[model samples]
Target: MKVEELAESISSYAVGILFPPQAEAVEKVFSGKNLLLAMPTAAGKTLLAEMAMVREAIKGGKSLYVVPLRALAGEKYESFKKWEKIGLRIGISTGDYESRDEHLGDCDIIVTTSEKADSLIRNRASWIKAVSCLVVDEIHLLDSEKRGATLEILVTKMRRMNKALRVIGLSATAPNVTEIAEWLDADYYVSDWRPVPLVEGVLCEGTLELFDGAFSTSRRVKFEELVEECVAENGGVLVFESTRRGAEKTAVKLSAITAKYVENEGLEKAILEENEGEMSRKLAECVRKGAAFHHAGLLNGQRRVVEDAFRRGNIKVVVATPTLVNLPARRVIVRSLYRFKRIKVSEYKQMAGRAGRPGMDERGEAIIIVGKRDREIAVKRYIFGEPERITSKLGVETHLRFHSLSIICDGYAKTLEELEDFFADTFFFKQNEISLSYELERVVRQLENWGMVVEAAHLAPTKLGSLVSRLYIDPLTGFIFHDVLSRMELSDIGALHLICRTPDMERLTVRKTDSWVEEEAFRLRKELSYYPSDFSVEYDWFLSEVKTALCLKDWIEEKDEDEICAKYGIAPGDLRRIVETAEWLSNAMNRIAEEVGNTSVSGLTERIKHGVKEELLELVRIRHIGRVRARKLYNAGIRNAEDIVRHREKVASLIGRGIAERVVEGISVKS
Candidate 1:
């Protein structure tokens, strides 16, 4: 169909007049060709993906919209709700790595993160075979050390699974779009068309230098004053900092200025209602004063409150880490160009691209904070430089181990040759003219020695190894768990420490002044399933694990989030992350335990999962009951669901009538 007719046909499906780039991309969707859209953020890349999905839905096929972040998955899922009006079933999957999300089979449009998509394929979800379309957001992440290989392997698998899969790759900072397009065998389109024009500038010592040879002097105007200028013009400011502490400090600093512009009491009240932790309370205070900080250290609820309020123009300023550079505003300020070291050109560009709210501002201003001496270099490098080229990060050992095992375990490859053939089609091979067979075999042989893979006439995953792959734990993590669970007794400290030792677990930083960590590690040494002796190379790492384990111990012992943060010097979000991750690893450990015929770790898992003591476990099983409330009920002798049902009045008085009634209603049905 012609572009005009196609636009007319899809007119009701999209909002506003489709932008020229969107129209060009939409025209290619019906051409049955794979396409790569290298466009700026808010250039309506999602609309193109939606068009592809709708086209697939009309053909009775499924479309998988894959993203790099779980938060982005939720955003994409919510945005796709418009298509539900046309009878398209939309589903989202970001967790439960063990489950195939079998229900997702009913979905016409499924939004998921790259890891979740990889897990679904690993679990062999049958619906994946039905997917005829794949829309990959942030396709540039193939260069990321943490998420790149997973994305590459996932895209490679989807294409290999369905030879006719219509793939659409989306990116904002991929300078080498043609390379990725060639890897996917897709037609590539790169456009600089942005709905709101962006002005890249450098602010140093009260002088502003813009990209297009424009210079302006506002006498003695500091960076904060520039932020105030934007606010004075009724525009929002997104300030990017390199570190979480910097982000928080900057937010607090700006709040004094922004408090005068504050209008939203709803955000402050909403945050206080949860009363989660010191970080949440701090965020509430900031939100009340019209400024907020955002980072991975903030709970999802707190982050969402800040994001929603800022988007609604209820908040004047948001100081955030680089992770949140996606939020658009009239003015984007880079607090520093150096994150300890110089950041990538791509990262700088991505932050700058977030300037200019499409409908709110005529043009967006992106300013980099630089010293007067570095001002010329910053302007020459950041404002004038192209984004760094995207490359494949698939050859790392951890990545190779997991993806290689996934291939053999899932029967995608049954022999060494078959495995090589599978990887031969990857973006890694396309970019580098070298083979990964050596790395692949080394990883596979390690897996084989770990009893994860076996080779005879055909290669296959050992039962234990297959379980490890299905559980989505690293093979090394599996080996560590299996080796220890096969012999040791299961204790809460031991279990948490074992997971902390695994490569999958994120450990707390061991500071120079944290000598107490050594004493604590020695004190808990007997309880640890594995520990290194004092002052060895691995001993420092062991101490860090002990520190993490102790944090989890504090959590289960009913320590307040504020107390834990103070003790560990971590934010509430950090503690929350550790607990969630420990819970998942504990589950993996228990599953490994059952496979190895050891005693169950479910008791430990439950404690770590819910951050509760053993006595409060039963009470916490009910909805609306957490550690504090669970302990309250247990202390009141309403120990279980049965007790809550029989002594409803006492439970209501202990907690509250509203929550108590809901709890009893839920428990009564379960009974």
Candidate 2:
């Protein structure tokens, strides 16, 4: 089919255009061929994906779109919802692993994060075989050490599970596009075309400049000079910094300059209209000056407030640490290059890719802010360098230990030869030009040492190991649960401390340099002295775990959110993430305890989830009632949800008229 003919049948847009590479990609997927589409960002690659998914839906075959982040998944879902009018059913999932398999197949297309997709496959969802088309977005993440392993192996395992599947991998531009194509056995197309072209340069004093190209302006004195110029000339400026603190600090600096010129009353009104939390007040102060910060530290609503305001052009500049890069913008200033270590060319390109808006500007520009320029640092990076190649971290020991046990737990592979053969298809094996047998043996032996897998003729997970994999935890964390049970007694604080030490929990460190964090954590950890401190470990690790346990202990003891945030040096978002992970691990611990007939901390699971003492569970479960109001009602002698209904006036006075009215309605509705 020609581009126009297919465009009409497949898309909801004005329905008549495709860039050359987008056309080629759509044609490849339409003809039942696997494909990899690599191009610069803002290059209409998602349009190509929509084409493939539409083709599959028309053929009555199911399609799945997988992303690396939950936010990206939600973004894709919102974008894809336009197709619902074209006879395509679309659903989005970013929920936990256990319930991932339920009814997602009812939709013609489902969008989910990579981890969710992996979990669905692990559970052997009935719809797995029906997914004839697979669209893996951000495919280059196969090279990331932190998350790449999951994407790489999930691709391998999916291919192994479903032979008839057609894979469509979309990626931002990297030099080794052809290597990835060969690894996936997919036809590939690379396009340098951009809907809005981007110019790359270094932040030399007073100059909008390029390293190789002949364009020059004046030398810029301070980094914000570039930011000031961009936001003044262009529609929006996205400034990328290295750390969350860096982003916050940079945004505050931009505030005074923005406030000097931009009208504040209108932006201040938008902040009130958004009405987000404590961060909103901070963001309002920044937004009133025509700027705001973006980072993972902000709550989801706070992030959305800034994002929506920026999208509407009410905010002039966004100072952020990589979080704001993927949002729409006319210019991106590279404020800092190091992220814990030197930034890779791939990451640089990803940030640089954010430098465009189609109709808003004539062209987009990405400039790196540099200092001194004497060391000649900007010469060999970005435009001069190729990005690092995609490699598997599946061989990384700590991650692989978990995956190896999972490989056996669900009967994905049986024998040593079978396991070896299964992993042979991975890019790891293909890219390394070395056998995976050594790496595989090392991880398997570690799992065996943990008594997770038996080293018989074929690999087999021990009963405990199988349970751990099913619970979706790291195999090493499973060992921690065993240790949690081994102790003669269990207290809520001690159990929370043990859970914090597990590999499954995501931790935000109270850094060692912070004087109080070290003394307070080290001083507090003596309470958890019962933990098996047999082998060597970092003092910082112990301190961080104790701090995490302290958060949990504080939470259940009815601490306020702002109080905890200030005390622990955590953001509201960080606390919420920590709470969610704790709830999940606590459930797993509960299950493990049940299997062992141990009930010491089994009840603590519910307590951790509710973040309350045992007596308050009743009042906490009622609609519109939280720890604060529940305590008020508790003191007033209204005990349970039952009492909450009877003492409606007391509930109203203590909580709120709005909540009390709703709680009455809730009780009536239930009855």
Candidate 3:
């Protein structure tokens, strides 16, 4: 059958109907061809996915939908749920949801975030191999530094799982759709046609003007001013700021002029009745009153309420962080808010595309807020510049090595070339190239260096390397593990938390405010004298954690918090955070340790407790010392409080005898 006729025939079975252009694009790709479909936002991209999924379902094959965010996954889940009436079962999973549901075993369609999919592959989840079609939504996100790597790895892994898996990528306004298409080894389709043509403009000198076709001005304009102009001209405006603080501040500024847009009188009444009613009322009133703020930090119910009001057109101006634009199709009416400012080109395209709803407006206006100079620049660039060329993944060795380790550790790949071929299929390393051969060599060498792999002729993972790969931790994290676990006595929780928290911990103290806390912690640690060299503040916290854990056992058995605190001299807040952190760490550590054949429950417990205590105390001591001063001591090979005490007289000569004596006295004092 012709593509159009096939689409028309399938439309009766499809729950969501695609527009003509979207259907045309799907028809072209679904005909056993690889494709990159770069459609505008809310242009029925998901509908195209549904068509592909339905076809796959009819073929008695599993369909996998990969989204960027958990929320998006949920949205897809809900949308796919409607297809249940059509006799297709759907299941959803994300990083937060790992429980293997038996229902998923019978699922015809599975929707999940890329990370979750990667994890499932690693775990060798049962249904992964059954996937016949993999749909990657927001495929442009392969450009994201952190997430892109995961997605790239996941795509490669998924293809390996089912070599016949027909891969489909969906994107909106990608700067380099062609590169992505090439990488996926798929046919490339780029479409600028929107249901409603977007008229883009800029606000300058207190007036909105058509952006002159200039590249320089568009890239450098003041976004706020452009938004202000949009607010002045449009029915209601949604301004997307990059930062939370910026969103809050902008809302505060705009609220001065615009009367808050309220959704309903009942919501207003509820807000007035709540504790901090004025704030609630003000927030409700902001939606009612004029402009309101929306972000992750707001209470979930409040955000939902606000979003509902905004969709109903009760809220006029919404000043929200970029995250507001990240919602899935259902939660947001992408076309409801007419004006957007301070958005990136990709985001601008998204926001602009959101301008015209099918039944709402004849044309949607998208204003790119550019300064006077930037306005000219943006126009020029828009006209002259080819969309930003998607760069090839050449120097991603570090990323690839880590991901390979994760995949292998997770048991997604059994061989090195399996990993390489998987990566070769990713948007990152899709283009066949020899340029990254050196990087690949370096990665292999790194794996060898970390004892993950041994090299004689061809590389093979050593037992330790195999374990490290299986554990899926960065080689450095593993190395750090060897360094820490070998010396410390930490509980599994404590060890894991210590390892997990280590990256965020400052190696040397830098702030003046932390000094008192550091001193007290260090002093308390020294008094314990469990291990003098190990008596850093972080270490003390960890040791105190051990004591706290014992106490918690006591408490759980009927002892009180006071009994625990008094016994250990640990603060309630610190103890709680540590315990929680430790618990998480323990779980992570156990998994990794087990993969390496180093799973020793007793050793893990000891290392976690010892490591946490030692690291905490060391952290606390450094917090007392300050980063600048700590560096001086570290350069001189002084590591712990004991080191300072031992070299007190010698240190006194170097840093003045009085200062040295004070340091010794400080280190010696018991908290």
What are the lDDT figures for the candidates, one per model? Answer: 0.83, 0.76, 0.57
Give per-residue CA lDDT, model 1, range 361-472, as digits (tens). Answer: 8988898888877476687778887777888888888888988999999888999988988888888889996777888889878989999899888899899988998888
Model 3: lDDT to the true structure = 0.57
Error of 1 at 121 (Å): 1.0
Worst 10 residues of 1 by lDDT: 14-23
Which scores higher on lDDT, 1 or 2? 1
Highest-scoring model, TM-score:
1
The candidate scoring highest on lDDT is 1
Q: Please report how far candidate 3 places residue 30 from its true position, in Å.
A: 3.9
For candidate 2, the per-residue lDDT at 81 reads 82
Candidate 3 segments whose C-alpha is farther than 4 A from its true place: 2-6, 9-18, 96-102, 211-236, 253-290, 299-302, 324-344, 382-386, 392-394, 407-426, 430-432, 435-437, 448-475, 491-497, 500-586, 590-671
Please give, for residues 203-276, the per-residue lDDT of candidate 3 as tens digits: 55555444333422324344444445444544456666666556666666666555532335665554334223
Per-residue error at 112 for model 2, in Å? 1.0
Find the 10 residues in a row with the least total lDDT in model 3.
Answer: 328-337
Sort the candidates on TM-score, descending order. Answer: 1, 2, 3
